[PDB]
């Protein structure tokens, strides 16, 4: 069975910035767990449909994980603007797969304020398609160079969410995974399309 | 001017001891909490420790969670972090941050120290 217990059931997750992404492939894709779970608050699929994920084969399954606020997760998704969708984590506009996410604030927020997940919120280009940066040079917001020192119009591009005890589900934590789905031997099957590999001891 | 000059560091052996300093200026030190961030070289900033107001409230991450302590100085406006039994995974670049301590900047509350190089190679 696919090791999607590892990524979805992880302990601690990365930040938006500096999302963990994992390799699934050669091994049964159960998505019925994904299915019959009631506390998934989003659950959409691009370029396929979700009812129908068991009666398709694909040969690769790139499964990115991180949190993110609640009012963030309208961004994850293809040709969209804001900090997290732009600086953070941007997708193809021809993207084909999942995006999965829940309110995780009973073990991502903490009375003093949770500073493991932060987001980058300045830089000077767009970011790409499945790009990752994890820098943590000084931005240039003004005229004149920084010259790596934070001063006037000139600062550090990242930034700490409070993930704060609040009632607002808005500005609270939320995991969220995104499933991309990849002419190659079909790897990652249904539990039925399953090209006996079930028996590889996975 | 909202600063965060931190100091020390620099190379020691397997098994040595280490202490940074993180002075602020330009906002009221003991009102804010202080953490401990540490980047290694190709990783993603981890989370290292994390301190209260002015309280005895202490927050280790897995990381370094038995050879490090934190602790502050407000009469002093100044922060430490005793690095001891340092491994060679250790060797990265140390940050101290106050959460929400700007105004009037936007999004941009945090504010970030410079850097603290820390080596140890045998």
């Known amino acids: 069975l696919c090791p999607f217990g590892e990524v979805f059931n992880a302990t601690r997750f990365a930040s938006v910035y500096a999302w963990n992404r994992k390799r699934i492939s050669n091994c049964v894709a159960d998505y019925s767990v994904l299915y019959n779970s009631a506390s998934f608050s989003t659950f959409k699929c691009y370029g396929v449909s979700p009812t129908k994920l068991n009666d398709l084969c694909f040969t690769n399954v790139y499964a990115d994980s991180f949190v993110i606020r609640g009012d963030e997760v309208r961004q994850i998704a293809p040709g969209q603007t804001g900090k997290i969708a732009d600086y953070n984590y941007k997708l193809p506009d021809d993207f084909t797969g999942c995006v999965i996410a829940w309110n995780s604030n009973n073990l991502d927020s903490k009375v003093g304020g949770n500073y493991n997940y932060l987001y980058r919120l300045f830089r000077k280009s767009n970011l790409k398609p499945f790009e990752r940066d994890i820098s943590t040079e000084i931005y240039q917001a003004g005229s004149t160079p920084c010259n790596g020192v934070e001063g006037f119009n000139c600062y550090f591009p990242l930034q700490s969410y409070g993930f704060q005890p609040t009632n607002g589900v808005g500005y609270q934590p939320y995991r969220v995974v995104v499933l991309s789905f990849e002419h190659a031997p079909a790897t990652v099957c249904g539990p039925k399309k399953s090209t006996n590999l079930v028996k590889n001891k996975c | 001017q909202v600063q965060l000059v931190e100091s020390g560091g620099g190379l020691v052996r397997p098994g040595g001891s280490l202490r940074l300093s993180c002075v602020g200026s330009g906002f009221t030190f003991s009102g804010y909490a202080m953490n401990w961030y540490r980047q290694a070289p190709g990783k993603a900033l981890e989370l290292v420790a994390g301190?209260?107001?002015?309280?005895?409230?202490?927050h280790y991450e897995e990381p370094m969670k038995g050879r490090v302590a934190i602790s502050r100085a407000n009469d002093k406006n100044t922060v430490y972090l005793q690095m001891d039994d340092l491994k060679p995974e250790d060797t990265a670049v140390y940050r101290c941050?106050?959460?929400?301590?700007?105004?009037?900047?936007?999004?941009?509350?945090?504010?970030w120290g410079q850097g603290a190089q820390v080596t140890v190679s045998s």
């Open positions: 301190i209260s107001n002015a309280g005895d409230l202490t």
């Open positions: 941050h106050a959460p929400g301590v700007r105004v009037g900047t936007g999004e941009r509350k945090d504010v």
